[PDB]
């Protein structure tokens, strides 16, 4: 019974515009300010999405706020790469309908290398032929893939919720294969695909953090929440107090 996939397909966030005025010359300040808006806006959907995930509400209230604040980067990035694959075919980074990056914008944003890694991540969806169901499960798993070293208020329930989503992932895979090797290798690819999101997210955390500090020097504006999160939560990740949960080592 696909009750679970039912829920994931139903609660999946629709399209979100960054409000970018594609009339303005692609400058550093304009591009990043629009991505910050996109992030702020897209953050709102992430919150509604999560609170709609099976079992998410049961987690403690504080932990609910923490897991979102720690894993939002990786979530938005993962989804972004999906939009780029299914759309612009991965040639470019489909951030929002009104904010699609090309080679030029990648350079002007002062984060060309990171964009390359994201484009590659985007390409992986093709190489691995990730079906839409696999995408959803993996994305859900990402919310539960980064936590504080000290632990959550109720780690007990977190470990169990995480464990379940993983089962769901396996369940998804083993619904077309028959071989003992087939389902096994597929799981290996995905768990790796998932791990690879972490290093990318970590570069953007660093990047946005530095950008925030010298935000007034470069005329880049950070919305209310985006500024608050990058200065309180992100620093815990960069300082190692919050760390991703990797499948492999």
């Amino acid at each position: 019974q696909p009750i679970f996939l039912n829920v994931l397909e139903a609660i999946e966030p629709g399209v979100v515009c960054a409000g970018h005025d594609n009339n303005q010359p692609d400058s550093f300040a304009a591009l990043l300010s629009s991505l910050n808006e996109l992030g702020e806006r897209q953050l709102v959907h992430v919150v509604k999405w999560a609170k709609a995930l099976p079992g998410f509400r049961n987690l403690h209230v504080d932990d609910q706020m923490a897991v979102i604040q720690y894993s939002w980067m990786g979530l938005m990035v993962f989804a972004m790469g999906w939009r780029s694959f299914t759309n612009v075919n991965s040639r470019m980074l489909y951030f929002a309908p009104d904010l699609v990056f090309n080679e030029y914008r990648m350079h002007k944003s002062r984060m060309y290398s990171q964009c390359v890694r994201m484009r590659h991540l985007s390409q992986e969806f093709g190489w691995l032929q990730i079906t839409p169901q696999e995408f959803l499960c993996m994305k859900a798993l990402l919310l539960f893939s980064i936590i504080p070293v000290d632990g959550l208020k109720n780690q007990k329930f977190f470990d169990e919720l995480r464990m379940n989503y993983i089962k769901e992932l396996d369940r998804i895979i083993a619904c077309k294969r028959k071989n003992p090797t087939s389902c096994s290798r597929r799981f290996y690819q995905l768990t790796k695909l998932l791990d690879s999101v972490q290093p990318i997210a970590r570069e953007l955390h660093q990047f946005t953090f530095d950008l925030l500090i010298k935000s007034h020097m470069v005329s880049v504006d950070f919305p209310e929440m985006m500024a608050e999160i990058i200065s309180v939560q992100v620093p815990k990740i960069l300082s190692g107090k919050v760390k991703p949960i990797y499948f492999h080592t």
Partner: peptide
């Protein structure tokens, strides 16, 4: 909170 504010957005939760």
């Amino acid at each position: 909170k504010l957005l939760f």
